[PDB]
Assembly symmetry: C3
């Protein structure tokens, strides 16, 4: 039995493509609560947060898009996550764009000083506000959280409340295939361990999971924050997303990551972001992405491919 909290974060200001705000609804309609209930999860539904809108939040330094709104929505989310984690719940957040991990990791770190992060994504999301080319904050969340990058990060409007809470040795990336040159330098320079699609092609998903846990929890037990962007999966499996990159995780690899995260017993928070149902060419393609999102969450809380979750005690006798 797991105590699990669920938070809806209908936020899109971390990027330019509209519809990602409908992400939490699409995941709920796909039957998330029912699936978590069937696994025996003691649930708490915090509903879908209404983020305080910012009227004056124009382009900053001809680069950064909506900084005030992103910083604000994330401060609000950080409080709700803090509450869920302090109440003793494993915190599930439904996105919304990936800028929301600023809020979810900040909130979770308020209670876990030794938290580690498993970041499952096609992208590194580690551009600083000076290295970014798009200026979209969904490509920058990790720069505000990493301690080693504080001196390389300018203070943005609405971002005063963030305190870096994770060290470079405490985050492992899985699924990378679209990394900006400044992001590649950051990962290499600061010894941030990653397993790109190329690493998985060579090692395979089993050794990748073994080496991830070896790096993070090999010396001691630690709470795990799984930050999962749906674009980590191939766009054939997850088409309803803003930044799709071909050559992604298969359905089996993705279930494997979630299953292995469940088996540690250390899962403490999970973000499931970037599901944009409006970006799918048909209704069933939007529905496939949403159902895939539920499978990741369910497998992260016990759903297995061997049917061993619901325990059978005795076979009836004739």
């Amino acid at each position: 039995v797991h105590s699990v909290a669920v938070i809806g974060a209908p936020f899109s200001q971390g990027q330019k493509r509209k519809g990602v705000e409908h992400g939490p609804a699409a995941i709920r309609e796909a039957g998330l609560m029912k699936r978590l209930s069937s696994l025996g999860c003691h649930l708490k539904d915090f509903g879908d947060l209404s983020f305080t809108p910012v009227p004056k939040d124009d382009l900053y330094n001809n680069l950064i898009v909506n900084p005030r709104s992103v910083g604000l929505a994330n401060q609000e989310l950080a409080e709700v996550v803090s509450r869920a984690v302090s109440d003793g719940y494993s915190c599930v957040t439904l996105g919304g764009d990936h800028s929301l991990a600023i809020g979810t990791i900040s909130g979770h770190a308020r209670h876990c000083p030794d938290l580690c992060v498993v970041w499952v994504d096609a992208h590194a999301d580690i551009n600083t506000p000076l290295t970014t080319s798009s200026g979209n904050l969904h490509g920058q969340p990790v720069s505000f959280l990493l301690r080693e990058l504080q001196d390389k990060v300018p203070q943005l409007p609405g971002f005063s409340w963030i305190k870096p809470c994770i060290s470079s040795a405490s985050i492992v990336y899985i699924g990378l295939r679209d990394v900006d040159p400044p992001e590649h330098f950051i990962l290499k320079n600061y010894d941030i361990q990653y397993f790109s699609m190329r690493d998985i092609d060579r090692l395979g998903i089993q050794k990748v999971m073994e080496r991830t846990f070896d790096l993070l929890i090999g010396k001691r037990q630690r709470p795990i924050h799984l930050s999962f962007d749906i674009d980590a999966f191939d766009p054939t499996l997850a088409p309803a997303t803003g930044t799709p990159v071909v050559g992604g995780l298969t359905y089996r690899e993705g279930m494997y990551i979630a299953e292995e995260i469940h088996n540690t017993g250390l899962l403490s928070a999970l973000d499931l972001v970037e599901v944009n149902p409006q970006l799918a060419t048909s209704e069933e393609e939007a529905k496939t992405t949403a159902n895939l999102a539920v499978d990741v969450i369910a497998s992260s809380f016990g759903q297995t491919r061997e049917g061993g979750h619901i325990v059978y005690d005795q076979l009836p006798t004739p």
Copy 2:
């Protein structure tokens, strides 16, 4: 072509069962595999073919449901009694018996008939374990229960169903290996674990890789001694993207390459003695190409089990023509 690396004597039996489940159209499965060019493909591999044709199945008039759950028990048990005779005949005559399905309840018949080869072993390729007892099942569909009737160790948990008195448990727990499991019922999981039935789920394939899965499968089954092999292949073991024309599809299945690899490894043992190719249902496909792709894939599995390979080399070439 006149030369081949091997010459196989293959018996083909069409078993269009449907009473082992409730989805209509699986009875058109043997016809779909035939239409996709099965006989021609086996001949192109230098097989000596004995086509036993498509078997006729007549349902029992007063076939009442056992414990108000188990649908068509007598019709399923009797059809399997008849199927078991044809399979025993084909194997006794020296043929590798290929049975086209039809739903997976037909394996009660093919395995029972085959065993009449007592030291046989079963390789069960499926998304499902089909090991529910008549008491543990929730659907009542007998295609989800065939292994329960065949296992010696399960006999005490299996009630004597009407039309099933003829069946004698022929295979022990240690003589059946599953491959592709991804939709296991909680009572099935209990049986597999408590009876020590070895399986390789989609998760084990994810970890080990299909090569290690086949090596370990043969170590467990034919490692101690050379034994005839019964390959019972449910098409739902493949991903619905590759095999959509099926009754119970489950996402995250075998890739085309994995399925061909299993079949080629089965051929390389030189021990295939009977093969079931079940659960092709052309009606359940949204399009003709989807139904044809499933039927074509079924032909590829059967052909690879009798020598067809990715590299070629099944057909022996003499010399190159000189100018």
Copy 3:
């Protein structure tokens, strides 16, 4: 920095399915030049070559279709390829059917007698004009180039210029899944090493690339000719091709082949053949194939999935 010459060879006469001539255009329209420019490549586009047409071209031995048209266009291509290799450039030939490899490998071997070939295809393309059943020359290019096969190859009209240059030990195949009985006989009896889809299933693409280079460049460094048939990829990824065969390379395996070729620093010439935009059922299937062809060429010239192709060594400070 890589000097790269792009030769559009709009061939079609090596087979019967019309539309493959519009392949170089489809690859260019998929942003090939923009992509290679962003890799820091010094580019020369020869555009689409206009091959001299042969109006009177009768079938040889009532089987071999269009032999003079194929033999001449390949002689014209070998001159251009020899000039590009001469001018310092790494030669990229856009197809067009695979018979154009007769020209590209011919031209290239004039300046690189020690070249080795990595043939990436669903097929072995090694039928002699006496073993072929189709009569399509795109299924025979390797017979004419292979030294050890000279006594089994008859002199075709407009094929006298061809000097067999590659030895059996200097060609390795990758991706083989549809091999004719005479083609299998040639491979085994002449000791031509290959990695079928089955060898890939067992070894994995990493070990395949390792063994490929051990056979070819294990004794010394040599120039590499990468002849890449788009049909080596599963038809789900590469549908707009003439001869599709199920159970091919995934996108990831294909990128890995290309990345490993790049990592040698020995790529001297590359063929990207058999993209036929006409054979796609929809506009997205034609663009998917063309985008895939651009990804292969780009990865063979440095494009990575980790992002370390561009030099970056200083982070901006606020």
